[PDB]
Amino acid sequence: RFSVAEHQERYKEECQRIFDLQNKVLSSTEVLSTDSATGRCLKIYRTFRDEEGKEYVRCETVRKPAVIDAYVRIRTTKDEEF
Amino acid sequence: PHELESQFILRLPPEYASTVRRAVQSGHVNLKDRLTIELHPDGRHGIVRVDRVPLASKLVDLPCVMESLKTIDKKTFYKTADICQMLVSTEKKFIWNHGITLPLKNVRKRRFRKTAKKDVEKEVKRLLSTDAEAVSTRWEIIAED
Amino acid sequence: IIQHSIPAVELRQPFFPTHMGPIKLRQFHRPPLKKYSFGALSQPGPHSVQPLLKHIKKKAKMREQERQASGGGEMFFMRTPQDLTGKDGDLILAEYSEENGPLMMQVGMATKIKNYYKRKPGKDPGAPDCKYGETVYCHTSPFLGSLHPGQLLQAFENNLFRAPIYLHKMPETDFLIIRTRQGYYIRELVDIFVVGQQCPLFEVPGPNSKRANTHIRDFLQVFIYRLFWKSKDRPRRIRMEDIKKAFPSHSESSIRKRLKLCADFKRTGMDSNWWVLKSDFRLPTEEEIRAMVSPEQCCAYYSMIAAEQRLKDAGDDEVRTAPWNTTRAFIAAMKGKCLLEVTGVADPTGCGEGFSYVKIP
């Protein structure tokens, strides 16, 4: 169960093989042909006053995970600040 | 003070490109008249005239970062400018998934890693602005159906 | 050994930014095409490109005459930003396979191409002639993979990193256009070098590292000394607002602490609202100012802030991929302190090709 000699030999051979492969792919002149965890969306209800007297309510749904994660993080931070 | 020079690659049709390359080698003022570049206010599009013929052009973003290097003695190289944009004369169309070199092709879906777009943060800022405009903001969660 | 251009050693603000905005950090070494506020290009319409082939030959002839004046000995001609411009001289293009380099040279930095050749066993014909760089012979390959005997690989050699380069012909369709406020300019490009994964010879500082904090303090102090040299007043004086414009991120109190030593403030009389240099203090010489902050240190700091911005934008694997961890791991491998797993999440390609710089027992 050699721990140092076996490990060093495998590391050296793998690095050399990758170095040869990386050089070959980049040096090649061959042409190449063109080729949430919860699973829950976020919905927001906004209440605003329109011109003169009105109180319309707008419901907007975000189905994009990255936007949902950013919005939730900011909302949680705002709650934490107060 | 000093403003860094901005360099963008220009791509032309091969028959058009060959005529332009011969004119560049000649260095004649005729080449200056023959080739004119016009930049749109958006800047994602360009109009290029080759031999006094207008060609529709769209600016595209090179995926890789390319640096121009100048060497007086051919042993020491000094960087002049960085090129990340190419104008092609004949969004996902404003992006180029292919490298300029033949080896680097389909780099975005091969020799590149999955990277964050940031964009998305700006869209969240717009949502925050609408929340501020609204007198009342209500939050609810909808499960996928 | 490497000599940087006089603007690059002087850490001039256009070449090296005092501060970078979050959008600027995302666009690292990838500048958008700007629209000039004023100038011929700013006015809407077609703009004619200008041939500078005669200019390139004349500038090269002038440089050769200056070398003849020096006796034919090699001469450093990059003493000004105008010299740094790519319109004159021979231009080569380098394309990086990695989407983001762990260390990226700032504009005006210099690199020497080194061609590494391993001799064939017993008698060998010799190293292949190379148009760019100087051929050298090494018993052991600098790269982790051993070079095969009879094989020569060109590489970019600089203090920040060493990266293998492969020469490829430029496409006939491709042309290089340099755009300036006065007019567009066109240069044909014939040679482009593909760049292999960079092997870091320098260490990127971690966010909030003691080294990173020292570099930030040194950069601010060096800028303050340069401002005193810039002032033409016999009692050198600088405005606090000018330093604040250069460094919005820096707190006024941190700038005040640097100002507290070597400068004094008058609210009344002559030099009112000015930070006058202390008479007792002696302003540091230009060589001392260059010694305090290295261009390599600035590039590592610039890489760290851009990587930190990317990490912040993307909400442990990503932390391993970050350059400061990779640079430390590669230096440890050269020391032999720890091995690096060849295959890891840190690999830039995301495929078997390329190496991952992650520390392993």
Side-chain angles (χ1 to χ4, degrees):
Chain A
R1 48 141 218 270
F2 350 95
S3 69
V4 40
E6 177 85 359
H7 218 238
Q8 178 264 344
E9 166 64 37
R10 294 311 158 94
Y11 156 82
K12 193 263 177 176
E13 60 92 18
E14 201 73 23
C15 274
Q16 190 174 1
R17 197 270 303 179
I18 287 304
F19 162 79
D20 211 16
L21 176 64
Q22 174 191 301
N23 289 3
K24 175 184 58 61
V25 168
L26 296 185
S27 188
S28 73
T29 61
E30 184 205 3
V31 290
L32 278 89
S33 60
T34 300
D35 59 335
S36 300
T38 60
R40 296 183 184 179
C41 300
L42 221 279
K43 81 172 168 179
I44 295 293
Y45 289 80
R46 287 149 186 175
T47 310
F48 84 108
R49 180 177 181 180
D50 208 10
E51 293 295 328
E52 302 168 359
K54 188 183 174 187
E55 288 179 0
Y56 184 69
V57 274
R58 335 189 304 270
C59 45
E60 312 188 17
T61 66
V62 184
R63 302 177 182 179
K64 313 171 184 178
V67 189
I68 292 168
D69 297 344
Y71 188 94
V72 167
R73 181 181 183 179
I74 295 191
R75 186 181 66 251
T76 308
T77 306
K78 168 187 178 178
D79 302 342
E80 245 62 40
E81 293 302 321
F82 196 72
Chain B
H2 173 259
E3 315 300 321
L4 300 180
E5 62 177 8
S6 177
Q7 305 185 8
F8 69 98
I9 298 291
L10 176 66
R11 184 160 292 180
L12 294 174
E15 38 172 1
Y16 284 75
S18 64
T19 78
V20 169
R21 187 163 297 269
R22 149 240 301 175
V24 170
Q25 292 160 355
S26 193
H28 282 181
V29 290
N30 194 20
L31 156 74
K32 163 175 184 60
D33 312 339
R34 280 152 46 98
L35 192 67
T36 77
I37 298 192
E38 173 167 358
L39 189 59
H40 278 247
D42 184 25
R44 289 313 302 174
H45 310 95
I47 323 183
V48 176
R49 266 138 296 266
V50 174
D51 307 358
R52 252 60 183 267
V53 170
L55 300 178
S57 318
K58 291 186 297 182
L59 191 67
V60 294
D61 299 336
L62 301 164
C64 306
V65 34
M66 308 194 320
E67 44 172 22
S68 306
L69 260 59
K70 61 173 305 178
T71 182
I72 319 293
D73 57 14
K74 273 182 172 55
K75 293 179 178 56
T76 326
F77 296 72
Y78 292 78
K79 178 184 172 183
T80 64
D82 240 338
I83 316 161
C84 74
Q85 274 152 340
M86 177 170 58
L87 187 58
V88 175
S89 315
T90 304
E91 223 258 285
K92 212 254 337 117
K93 240 343 245 83
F94 288 152
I95 245 70
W96 215 235
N97 301 80
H98 323 302
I100 276 192
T101 56
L102 284 178
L104 287 181
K105 188 96 190 10
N106 327 294
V107 214
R108 239 117 197 188
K109 18 242 206 102
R110 198 221 10 174
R111 267 238 187 230
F112 270 15
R113 33 193 357 173
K114 330 246 261 139
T115 40
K117 311 295 182 175
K118 44 178 176 182
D119 295 340
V120 171
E121 203 165 344
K122 197 176 305 178
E123 301 159 7
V124 183
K125 298 166 189 175
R126 303 164 208 175
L127 293 181
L128 192 56
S129 302
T130 57
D131 298 329
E133 297 159 10
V135 185
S136 176
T137 301
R138 174 63 191 178
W139 155 72
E140 302 192 13
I141 307 185
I142 27 170
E144 187 181 359
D145 192 20
Chain C
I1 163 188
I2 317 287
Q3 181 187 5
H4 311 298
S5 68
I6 292 301
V9 301
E10 286 194 4
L11 256 51
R12 300 195 191 184
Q13 321 310 330
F15 306 96
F16 289 80
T18 37
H19 168 261
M20 263 186 291
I23 41 180
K24 207 66 62 180
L25 286 173
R26 296 181 180 94
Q27 305 158 346
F28 196 47
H29 294 271
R30 282 184 177 92
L33 226 68
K34 65 176 301 295
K35 181 183 177 179
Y36 302 108
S37 301
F38 55 93
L41 285 219
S42 85
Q43 288 106 37
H47 309 293
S48 296
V49 304
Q50 316 181 16
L52 30 71
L53 170 81
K54 43 173 184 305
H55 151 78
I56 301 175
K57 78 189 60 174
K58 282 302 297 173
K59 199 64 63 183
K61 182 192 308 181
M62 187 189 312
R63 286 156 176 170
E64 185 66 27
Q65 289 160 346
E66 294 160 355
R67 181 159 297 184
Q68 296 310 301
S70 81
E74 94 91 13
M75 192 170 173
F76 169 74
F77 304 106
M78 328 299 298
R79 300 171 182 179
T80 13
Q82 292 81 22
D83 303 339
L84 276 177
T85 64
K87 303 194 309 174
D88 34 44
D90 173 30
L91 243 60
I92 81 163
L93 247 55
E95 192 164 358
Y96 288 87
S97 300
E98 297 173 314
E99 187 169 352
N100 302 316
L103 294 142
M104 199 71 68
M105 296 192 312
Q106 285 288 147
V107 175
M109 283 197 54
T111 177
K112 284 174 178 288
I113 299 190
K114 298 298 174 57
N115 322 319
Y116 298 101
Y117 171 75
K118 191 167 182 178
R119 309 189 195 269
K120 306 189 175 54
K123 190 58 182 299
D124 61 311
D129 190 13
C130 299
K131 180 182 180 185
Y132 297 116
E134 17 173 345
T135 164
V136 277
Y137 315 96
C138 53
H139 35 271
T140 170
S141 170
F143 326 105
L144 299 173
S146 171
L147 278 159
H148 293 90
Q151 174 197 2
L152 172 138
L153 181 58
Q154 307 200 19
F156 266 148
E157 191 266 332
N158 55 79
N159 306 344
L160 283 172
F161 62 91
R162 185 186 302 103
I165 50 182
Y166 320 83
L167 183 51
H168 279 257
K169 52 187 61 181
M170 275 279 297
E172 322 299 333
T173 65
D174 273 335
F175 279 104
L176 179 60
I177 303 269
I178 309 187
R179 80 187 291 269
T180 72
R181 192 177 300 261
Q182 302 90 4
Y184 280 102
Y185 298 108
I186 179 167
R187 285 202 46 166
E188 62 164 353
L189 233 289
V190 69
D191 287 327
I192 181 164
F193 279 91
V194 194
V195 176
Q197 163 164 357
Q198 306 180 8
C199 301
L201 305 177
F202 199 78
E203 177 186 340
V204 171
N208 297 355
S209 176
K210 182 193 60 179
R211 175 59 239 177
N213 298 345
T214 302
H215 176 264
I216 291 174
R217 152 182 42 179
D218 292 355
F219 198 85
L220 177 60
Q221 192 64 75
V222 145
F223 176 70
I224 288 178
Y225 289 147
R226 294 190 177 270
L227 278 192
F228 278 123
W229 283 112
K230 196 170 306 182
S231 175
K232 301 156 299 303
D233 305 293
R234 296 193 181 184
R236 307 178 178 271
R237 42 179 204 174
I238 63 181
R239 284 202 172 274
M240 160 76 71
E241 25 270 343
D242 304 348
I243 325 174
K244 288 174 49 182
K245 283 187 290 292
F247 298 93
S249 59
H250 278 59
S251 67
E252 293 180 16
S253 297
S254 68
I255 305 183
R256 272 189 289 265
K257 290 184 302 181
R258 306 274 64 86
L259 282 168
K260 163 202 56 186
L261 40 112
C262 104
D264 45 293
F265 188 75
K266 307 300 181 183
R267 292 177 173 89
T268 182
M270 189 45 182
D271 304 345
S272 57
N273 292 166
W274 282 95
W275 280 92
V276 259
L277 184 71
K278 280 187 177 58
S279 301
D280 43 271
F281 174 75
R282 172 216 53 96
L283 208 52
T285 84
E286 172 67 30
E287 188 71 30
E288 297 177 5
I289 305 180
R290 291 172 181 177
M292 297 170 187
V293 191
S294 171
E296 273 73 19
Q297 292 173 353
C298 304
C299 300
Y301 165 72
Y302 296 150
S303 299
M304 174 255 294
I305 50 185
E308 182 181 352
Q309 170 77 205
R310 291 187 289 264
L311 281 167
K312 217 166 307 179
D313 296 337
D316 194 30
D317 300 8
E318 211 186 357
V319 186
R320 302 198 291 269
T321 80
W324 45 89
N325 289 352
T326 70
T327 56
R328 291 179 51 91
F330 188 75
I331 295 179
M334 303 309 288
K335 293 198 295 291
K337 187 191 66 184
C338 75
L339 300 184
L340 301 188
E341 44 171 355
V342 189
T343 158
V345 291
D347 190 291
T349 309
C351 298
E353 316 166 359
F355 306 90
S356 66
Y357 304 146
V358 241
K359 299 188 177 181
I360 228 57

